[PDB]
């Protein structure tokens, strides 16, 4: 009654028999932009079921020495399904998201993944090691797309901030002996009512193994981690020709 | 009707004092287990003193007012040092243009970066003197040059006519000048972190310096000069202090734990990654 | 009266623009729950948070 | 003119003075605000959130910092062994420095209230065991053995479907408030010591790792407050920021 | 005397400070006012008035400036040709600089609202034709062809007794306000691009000019406002004024 | 040709949503545009040289000597107003002496 | 009271002459029509302005 | 500004002057008091012993 | 020109004339001239007891 | 990543041994005749 759950939206349904509740980021549900906050005057387009449905991105392999991964929203979907198309044809965009990270093992495996949502996840470089080089992250690192990227220094989240404090953000743990997934519902967060789905990532999703994976030789060693996400209340405005970036 | 298909669990409370403690006795039973939790849910423990031990009653009158974000931020702090030397490398022309950026000093920066978005008014105080702290009878002009307005190019530039821009004329011997500044962003709040790019187009390594730059935070230029057609014989140091007031903050984040390297980004010294906490020899000894 | 141009109740002012006003006394409102217990099925304090 | 007399204080600039200053833009109107999730009003809201405690803060970890975020437990051959120990002092150099609570309380001179530490077991489902977590109030050094630690405030934790347990560090002080504890005179404000012992043993069947880890999360309880705002030690500007 | 304490700000002179100053002529009475037509109260009143847009602002026009006040249209032999293009950015260097709206909005840092451009056809009564005027929101460069421009906000204009047509440049922005757009970081505030295409063709019978002109007039709509008063770039004092 | 500006609005040319616009129109009131002190004259009184070394200067009041303020006023044909004059005085190099 | 000698409602003053008073809060009155639609036969928004 | 005139006494520091001074810690709250025996209010209380 | 700063127990003490601590972003500081009248401020009861 | 774009269910093994994939009636015609290679492929239901 708290470990079992079903998420149905659009023409997609997700099930799980070993959940650990669901988190509503900052206690707020996604919602279309009201007339008091809106500023752009054109009537928005709200595709509904064609874009607010679950999308499953590539799977990652959890190894005994994995550092962790991260994805950026809405970057991950800017080129997938009808959502991507609306994101490319419109200047303005806004929406919430239902993030469902999946990972199952056996009652003999062990390990804990911290799944968190960090809004405005700005990355930094190691500054050439010495700190005298003012280098910057490449486009491929700031917006890794659907494939996601790997963290090089998880301890400081590749941004000079302690991973030990990441729990101050909406999050769940996927502790193999307890649950096999994490679910976080994220509302739209920005200083503006709508924004470019191409030039700005509202938040990043981080999956980091704080407690390394471990198992005895002989047990299945391919332990994948899959990410399935669903836009919620997706709105679009400022229609024109398609633009990829 | 021809087509049928076409048809916050958190509230604020006023807590002026710390929670009291109710007296509790011993609990010996099954089914109920307050001590056991499931951190996986993402929730913090709800266990309280009385659930784990026998407590007495404590009428706690401890105030919670000093930790209100308002009292945490409304303390003037250094955000800029503008020097204007008479002889040397820097501007010996008697005028200086400074692009407004409050990320040049650590103390105040680390406090602001505790949050993602912040909206506020500010009180700016200008402490001016000679490099050695002495004071002389010198007349100065401070001018705010908003984005798009012509920046002065010399000590006699027409821009100093300041017919529309706001200017402050004061003597180095007067008390520090002080003025209030409103919330001026085109957006609804300033943001210390902007995970994106300012414009469209390809983002080649040649222009990667664009990453993280949000015009909504660029408030313009602060220009200063000595009032006169002739050069002044005095070196001048201007220390600018900012005091946040009428503040609102959104989305807390992990506090900076690596030294700051640059104003415009979170880059850290890769070869020397400091540990958030000091170390010891064994885990079983203090 | 004055212009309501403050960034954001017991402040002091002598100018026509509200943002010129002092900081005033800070209020003691709080809402820890949105950060400490942002879960759908509000887990109780007696029975186990998972069952 | 009206008779006035300037008093001491005249011309001074107090950085915390809350006065009124002339506005630079008359008639200016700020961009209207819009709703944004996650607003905070008091730092106490953040202090109540659990963050990871670096209990395993060894010198031999520094080059691989991820290992400080969790400490181990494993099959013992001897009984009543000590698993780990650390001070409860939230504003002292040590494990608490990694928590948002520790960092934030370093911006204040004094603090008061009960603390809370939740331990999450990350071993395999097949592993079981009972641990004795104890809190020793000021006065006694690290308890020599379990039979001594057992005399203070403690919780006997049993592994099961509930991955975590909570050790309450009840506010037990002589003074209403404590300043940050350090070696020397200020040790008068020390909160005490936390020690984790093996109540029984970490037992596991064939096929499961004989070593697992525990993550420690800490935060403040509802009766916690801080006062006397000050600058932190945890941030410095060694060089200029270009 | 009454106890007072001078605070920071003392003696300073803020050019925008709205205080009180001693009157030099006590009892003086200004000449009474008399009615005068044309009083204005807010610059917004002037911003709503259409003024000529210099769409044809070429380098080869500078010596004969009158030619910048109108652009041509003429019999085409090819279909879907581009007639003209320009940015919609009202405070940017370019065609808008010639309008009272552009000049006035350069006295403010930020602006918000919908714009409006009315095109008046000044060809002969016998000439006919259909034009496609489009407004492309931020993101896409000047549309390569008509079939691409057609995907944005647009109006298909038909020549007739009604000499003019109005293209509305609806406020479509992410931020409530925009600062003036320039190359670089501030291009984030660009409004977009306006392009004029031949929907059909400029057709004319024997005896009528095969080339005519169009005058473009621009102004702001009712939801337009500006804020953050500043000095303009459009006026300088290179030398002294005798 | 009528001499009138277009009366067409957003909703006439496109499909619009509802927007409750709270944007203020107060800063563009002529009062806030003009009530900002600006330079209108620089009167020098040198000790040695060409100009008045007699210790006194007569200046005929004319505010059209400086561009910034002049261009703003010339936006209108007629103007009626009171004015606040501020006098900033110092030595040519900006120093101050007991004079 | 004071002398009504101001060049032209929520101002401040300490002298007997009104013109010494501050600028005060600016009013937001407007009349665009006299500049944007000064025609005799007020042209509508629906039918063509010429017929 | 309001017309004022500084009078003799200006700038002086009288050690017994009972005026008001700006507070250094806004919003600060002192530790609550607790009952303590032996409070005295007037030196005359001690003189009678 | 002088600067007086209150450094509560636990806050970093300045080690030089240019120490970062003088940024005084949180500690209360007073800036005053030697020619100004004596600076003056009110201090609350700050003991933990 | 392509199949995921259609109607689908993500099944998780546990105490509940089974899961149900609904093949919702999505057709142009109210009825379908049996599908075969050729003209009648017009009535094909789809792929699982
Ligand atoms: C008459 C002259 O007096 N004017 C003084 C003055 C002082 C400050 C002025 O603007 C100050 C803007 C700051 C309150 C906020 C600056 N911000 C906003 C966010 N931001 C920033 C910096 C680096 N990265 C992200 C954001 C900033 O630096 C303008 C005029
Ligand atoms: C005790 C001494 O303080 N008196 C100062 C003072 C300052 C200004 C004074 O008169 C100022 C008149 C201005 C407000 C208007 C001058 N005008 C009116 C219009 N006008 C002008 C100039 C050139 N062409 C057309 C009109 C002007 O130059 C008189 C006394
Ligand atoms: Cl000048
Ligand atoms: Cl300094
Ligand atoms: Na002041
Ligand atoms: Na005055
Ligand atoms: Na005083």
Author numbering:
A (entry chain B): 10 to 254
B (entry chain A): 2 to 8, 19 to 297
C (entry chain D), G (entry chain D): 13 to 20, 27 to 69
D (entry chain C), E (entry chain C): 1 to 242
F (entry chain A): 51 to 149
H (entry chain C): 1 to 49
I (entry chain A): 150 to 198
J (entry chain C): 147 to 194
What does the paper say about this structure?
Coxsackievirus A16 (CVA16) and enterovirus 71 (EV71) are the major causative agents of HFMD. The viral genome is enclosed in a non-enveloped icosahedral capsid that is built out of 60 copies of the structural proteins VP1 to VP4. VP1 surrounds the 5-fold axes and VP2 and VP3 alternate around the 2- and 3-fold axes, while VP4 forms part of the inner lining of the capsid. Structural analysis has revealed that each of the 60 VP1 proteins in the enterovirus capsid contain a hydrophobic ‘pocket factor’.
The crystal structure of CVA16 in complex with the uncoating inhibitor GPP3 was determined by crystallography. To this end, CVA16 crystals were soaked with the inhibitor dissolved in DMSO because GPP3, like most pocket-factor analogs, is rather insoluble in water. Data were scaled together, merged and the structure solved at 2.75 Å resolution by molecular replacement using the structure of the mature CVA16 virus. The electron density map revealed that the compound replaces the natural pocket factor (modeled as sphingosine) with only a negligible shift (~ 0.2 Å) in the polypeptide backbone of the residues lining the pocket, reflecting its shape similarity with sphingosine. The surface area accessible to solvent, calculated by Areaimol, is 12.3 Å2 for GPP3 in the VP1 pocket whereas for the sphingosine it is 11.8 Å2. This demonstrates that GPP3 is buried within the pocket. As expected, GPP3 binds with its pyridine ring close to the entrance of the pocket, with the carbonyl oxygen of the imidazole moiety hydrogen-bonding to the backbone nitrogen of residue Ile113, which is also the case for sphingosine, and with the phenoxy ring sandwiched between two hydrophobic residues (Phe135 and Tyr155). This binding mode was also observed for EV71 in complex with the same compound, except that EV71 has a phenylalanine at position 155. The docking of GPP3 in the crystal structure reproduces exactly the experimentally observed pose with an energy of interaction of -66 Kcal/mol, expressed as a sum of van der Waals and electrostatic energies. We investigated the interaction of GPP3 with CVA16 by determining the crystal structure of it in complex with the whole virus particle and identified the key residues involved in the interactions with the capsid binder including Phe135 and Tyr155 which make a hydrophobic sandwich with the phenoxy moiety as observed for EV71.
